[PDB]
Design a protein around this ligand. Sequence first.
Ligand SMILES: CC(=O)N[C@@H](CC(C)C)C(=O)N[C@@H](Cc1ccccc1)P(=O)([O-])C[C@@H](Cc1ccccc1)C(=O)O
Ligand SMILES: [Zn+2]
Length: 306
Amino acid sequence: STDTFNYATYHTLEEIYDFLDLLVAENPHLVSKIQIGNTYEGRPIYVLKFSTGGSKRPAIWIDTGIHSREWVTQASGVWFAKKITQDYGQDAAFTAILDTLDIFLEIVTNPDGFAFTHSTNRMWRKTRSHTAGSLCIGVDPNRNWDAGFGLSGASSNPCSETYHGKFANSEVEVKSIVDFVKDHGNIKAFISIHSYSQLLMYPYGYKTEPVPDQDELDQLSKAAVTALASLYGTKFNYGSIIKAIYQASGSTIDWTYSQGIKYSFTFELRDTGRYGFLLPASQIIPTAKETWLALLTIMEHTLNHP
Ligand SMILES: CC(=O)N[C@@H](CC(C)C)C(=O)N[C@@H](Cc1ccccc1)P(=O)([O-])C[C@@H](Cc1ccccc1)C(=O)O
Ligand SMILES: [Zn+2]
């Protein structure tokens, strides 16, 4: 059951999918699973919805595993799902969050990539869509969104790690999120989680110009990384994507923010390079724990600022 699940190890796609079902079955009045589409290879795409009721409540969205090799992100998502059901009705501050906000959690945002990192190539990053006249496979799901699509910060070469695709939303894994969010209409925070580098970022990645909500986002980022540090002393930096890392066009939070989702953030988790993507299983739960502190901070702020 989810009480006997090993949270400190990396799992396969099937185990994570079995986990989703276990958690819904153990918490039928709190947690449900939504299929938002099928991947290029036909695998279902699922979102957990955590809700104490109401009808299209204001919601936080959290996604992990958009880039499939980023294993700590999926492993942390599993932990978060469990943390939510452990804490609701036990922790008062968290209970107050979920008595008002819904939470949507997409643990494996790129299932075909994820299965590929298990079957064939531990370092696979992209989707697994085939591109004609190319033998190279896949599109960078973090360059396929409709925000500066195709501008500097992405590549038109199908073989590139940052290939943008033929057009915005050409990847079904991306378009499925787009349609979910637009159909929902009441997403107030959108958090995309990646690794590694220990960063918390707000938009834009595609241009240098500051977002109009920059001072609010920046101070929230400061509050979040300070919360994160309070646990093991892990040091995160924060800023716009373009300043903290590099120019990237067609990325997720640029899109979400342009739809009016003000609290659009992207995390880069542990570590800063020693292990990079190959983070030991012994760092899964501390990464998750400290990251949960940062998440609490953003959620509470979203709760309090309509
Ligand atoms: C071999 C390697 O490291 N490749 C990079 C991606 C290529 C550009 C070289 C990468 O995979 N970056 C991931 C994490 C990272 C690694 C080293 C330094 C900094 C970051 P990333 O999660 O894939 C970085 C991410 C940044 C981002 C976040 C949100 C909106 C726009 C861009 C991205 O490139 O999508
Ligand atoms: Zn990434």
